[PDB]
Every structure is written in C-alpha cells, then in structure tokens.
C-alpha cells in the first residue's frame, strides 16, 4: 500500500506536527500549511532550501518584529497569511464622530488608546503635520516601534495572496518578480504595510501590488524603493485600495538613501484608489548629487525621466496633497481628486501633458496657496475645477478646457485657449441678461475689459431684448457702450467723446469718431480720410 499511497495523494506538512517552523520547512515538499498559531522571534529566519512551495495559512504568525522567510523556489505561493504583534501600542486617531480629521495637537492626543488598530503609532512625520504634538505626546507614546513583519529576502517569482493582519508589515527585500496580491485588508504597523527595496543588487523589476487594501499604519501603505519595471512598465500598483494612511497611499521614494539612490522608474500606477491618507493620496516624486543615479549634470533636479504610466487613478479626504510627482516627459491621465484638506496636485513637472484631470474641492483648509500647482513648461488638456465648496497657478502652463465654477481672479497660467469650437451658443438661467464677457488678466485679473450683452427689454416673453457692446474705463467695467434695440426701438445708440477729439483718439484710415463741442451744443466727426489725412467736419447740429 505504501508505494501505492505515496503515488496517488498530495503532499503536504503541517506546522501542527513540528515545534519550528524550520522543522516544518525542510521537511515540506509540496504544501506547507500553517495550522496552529506560531509565535516567532523577531529575526526568525527560515531557509526553504528552493522547494517551490505551496504555503496554506489558516492560523497565525505572532510576533514584534520580522519572521524572514529565505530561499522559495520560483514560482512559490503564500496564502491567508496573518500578521500580529504581541505588544498593543498606543495609538492616536485623527479623525472624529463624523469623520471629521481634527487638526489641534490637544485634540489629537486626547484620542490616545492602547490598540492594534483603529488608529496609528505617532512618528516624526507627526510632529510636522499637528504642530506642537511634540511637546504634548506622553513620553511612553512616543518612539514606538511596533510591526509584526513578513519579510521575503533575496527571492524571485513568490507571490503572497489574501495576507491581512493587526499592526501587519509586508516587506520584499531584494525580491524580484513577486507580487502581493488581493491583500485582505491588513491594518498596518509602524512601517510600511507593502514594501518593495531593493538597495542592494540588481534595481528591483516584475515587483506588484494587484488589487486588495490596506488600512491604517503609520507610514505609506505601498513604497518602492531603487526598482525600474523597464520599458516594459514591469511593476507597480494596479486595482488596489489604501484607507487611512499615516504617511501615503503610495509612495515612491525619494533622494538617497544610505549610499545609493531609493528613486524609481517605469512603474505603472493605475486603476486605483486612496482615501483619507493622512499626508498625500500619492507621492510619485523622484528627487527632495544623485549617487547610484543620474548626475544633476545630465537631469536638473525634479527632471528626472521617471517614465512611469500613470492612468485612472481617484483619490478623496486626504488631510494634505492629493496628487503630487515630479519628473520631466511625463504623460498623466484621467485622474479624479476630491475633497482634500492640502492641494488636490502639486506638480513639480517640466514638458509634461496631464489629460483629464479633475480637482474637486481641495485646499480646503488652506495648507497650501493653491488646489494644483505646476512649477515647469507643462500641458493640461481638460481641467474640471471647483465642487460644491489661488485655484491653479501653473505659470509656465498652457492650458485648455477648463470647466467649473472658478473664479477667474484665482487662475494663473502661461496661455488659456480653446481654439477649436464650433459655433456657440451662450445660454443664460436664472438672469434678465446673457454675457460674453472678455477679461485680460495683463490688464485686471479681477476686471472683466469688455462685454457683448443681450438683455431683456421689458420682461420675459417680451419677444425684445437689446445687445450691448462695452468697454471697461476708470476701471468701471461696461463704463462704455453701443446698444442696438434699447427699448425696441430698433436703432443703435452710439456713445461719442465727450469732449474735443485729439488727433490721436482716431485709428484707422476710412473711419470717422463722433465728439462733442459743447459751446455750439454740435456734435462734430473727426475723420481720418482713406487717404490718412485727418479733417474735423460738423455731423449734427441744432
């Protein structure tokens, strides 16, 4: 029977019948599940001797501190696993009853409790976002450093599916080709809860995070570190969620870190979300002289070609930056940004084009000057600003379509134009009058300069209206106007000088400029003959 037994069934160990997991490890051949609780030292490492393996978690790994899981064959599976610390630290919950963030360093500390979740452990970061925290923190709530970490070291093609946790940590260090997929929803510790270094080695490529969310934690939920995915765009974050971030949503990092760079390039960011993150929605820069990098000789700084493919991507609540990147060549779309406490954008980008691009209600609290700011020559193709609640200052920026309720006064941008309309149509609600109006911002950014009017004579089903042609002087707007049909009387009122007409007040050759001589009650024409010459000559008289 044994030799027929060990031909027909499935392999697999259980950490039931082993007092380590190492034990459990070097005898595995096939499965591997994990059915018992097990408490792990913080550095416990296990060697799985290149077994591709099939790891089934249906218990937990208890621990402060990083289990570090070495030597998975290609192609290796990790599923259900659950991280949890044994230390219940003290965390601070920003947000209120009505999920309202609160802003006070009192308030904040004031939600102080001891949990492994609902909240985040206070860092440094949080000494600058609630000025004065510092100072107010308990000592025992300050310095914390609790994570129960998963770290996979040095492995190619292992991929970890469904992991959750309490104060959970996801770490790939010099991994290759892995991915963490439909994450269910771990609630973070005080590290990164995905992360990808590779500092050392070759730049990490084939690395991703596909579908899933996390909660909580108290620094970015993803963050990527010295990988390039390649012309291929292999790696990045696509379908997945991150809820209530202490840092960011997603972040890839910047500057060096150690003696070489953390920066990345060619990753792809699409079809993703991230709500309430405490800092930004998504951090994409690349710079803060670039050892490991390019020299600031070849790419300036913020002018890095990071390359990375960024599409459909919608971010709400964050307490500061919605959307921010830096990088030269870029191509962005279809991003949606509402609600936001900081700018819904803050672009440090050069020769860049963003299409459809949506900044709903941002700046709410005033952190920054602006909703979306673009320092370098950029394009924006689709603007839609202003919800229900300066608004962009692009100085170098040509930009066109924009659609929203902006106050004109609060946009600043290189050239606006919307050079392909068809024939228009300008249809007034609510009003006894329809507007085209012209401001030049050179001359007033607050001062409509003048104005083609249609408005009611009478009232409504009158069959009458009059159109109003004007001109803005002594800084009254419409101070002056030709009318046709005022009253319905069917003919044009046309303002003349006031006074004597200079030489110079007449532009044009073949034209004539009414003005008044008030000491014979004469209006006179100043008249610039087709041959330039100009001759004064009596238009009407008593």
Same mark, same amino acid.
């Given at each position: 029977y044994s030799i027929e037994a060990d031909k027909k069934f499935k392999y697999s160990v259980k950490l039931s019948d082993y007092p380590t997991l190492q034990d459990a490890a070097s005898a595995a051949v096939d499965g591997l599940l994990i059915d018992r609780d097990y408490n792990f030292y913080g550095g416990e490492t296990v060697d799985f001797g290149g077994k591709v393996l099939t790891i089934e978690c249906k218990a937990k790994f208890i621990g402060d501190g990083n289990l570090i899981f070495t030597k998975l064959g290609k192609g290796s599976r990790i599923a259900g696993v659950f991280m949890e610390s044994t230390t219940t630290p003290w965390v601070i919950k920003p947000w209120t009853d009505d999920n309202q963030w609160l802003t006070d360093a009192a308030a904040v500390v004031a939600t102080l409790k001891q949990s492994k979740t609902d909240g985040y452990q206070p860092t440094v970061s949080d000494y600058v976002k609630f000025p004065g925290i510092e100072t107010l923190l308990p000592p025992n709530a300050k310095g914390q450093n609790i994570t129960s970490t998963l770290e996979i070291r040095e492995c190619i093609g292992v991929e970890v599916h469904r992991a959750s946790g309490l104060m959970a940590g996801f770490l790939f260090r010099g991994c290759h080709f892995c991915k963490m997929v439909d994450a269910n929803n771990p609630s973070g510790g005080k590290?990164? &809860? &995905?992360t990808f270094e590779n500092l050392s080695g070759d730049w990490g490529k084939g690395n991703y995070v596909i579908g899933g969310r996390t909660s909580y934690g108290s620094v970015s939920s993803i963050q990527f570190l010295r990988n390039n995915g390649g012309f291929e765009r292999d790696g990045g974050v696509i379908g997945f969620t991150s809820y209530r971030a202490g840092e960011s949503g997603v972040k890839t990092w910047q500057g060096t870190v150690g003696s070489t760079t953390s920066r990345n390039y060619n990753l792809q960011f699409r079809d993703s979300v991230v709500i309430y993150p405490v800092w930004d929605g998504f951090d994409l820069g690349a710079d803060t002289d670039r050892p490991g990098d390019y020299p600031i000789t070849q790419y300036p700084l913020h002018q890095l070609p990071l390359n990375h493919l960024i599409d459909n991507l919608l971010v709400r609540g964050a307490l500061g930056v919605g959307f921010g990147m830096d990088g030269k060549g870029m191509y962005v779309s279809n991003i949606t940004v509402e609600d936001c406490a900081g700018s819904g954008a803050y672009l440090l980008t050069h020769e860049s084009v963003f299409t459809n691009i949506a900044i709903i209600d941002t700046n709410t609290k005033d952190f920054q000057a602006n909703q979306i700011y673009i320092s370098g020559a950029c394009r924006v193709n689709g603007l839609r600003l202003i919800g229900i609640r300066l608004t962009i200052d692009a100085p170098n920026s040509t930009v066109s379509g924009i659609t929203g309720m902006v106050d004109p006064s609060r946009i600043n941008v290189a050239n606006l134009a919307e050079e392909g309309l068809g024939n228009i149509r300008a249809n007034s609600f609510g009003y006894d009058s329809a507007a085209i109006k012209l401001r030049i911002h050179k001359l =007033?950014?607050?001062?409509? =300069?003048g104005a083609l009017y249609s408005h009611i004579n009478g009232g409504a089903g009158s069959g009458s209206a009059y159109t109003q042609l004007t001109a803005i002087s002594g800084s009254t707007p419409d101070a002056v106007s030709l009318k046709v049909n005022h009253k319905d009387c069917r003919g044009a009122e046309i303002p003349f000088v006031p006074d004597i007409a200079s030489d110079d007040f007449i532009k044009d050759s073949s034209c004539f400029l009414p003005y008044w001589e008030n000491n014979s009650t004469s209006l006179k024409a100043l008249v610039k003959k087709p041959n330039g010459e100009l001759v004064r000559l009596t238009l009407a008289t008593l």
């Open positions: 590290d990164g &809860i &995905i =007033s950014k607050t001062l409509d =300069s």
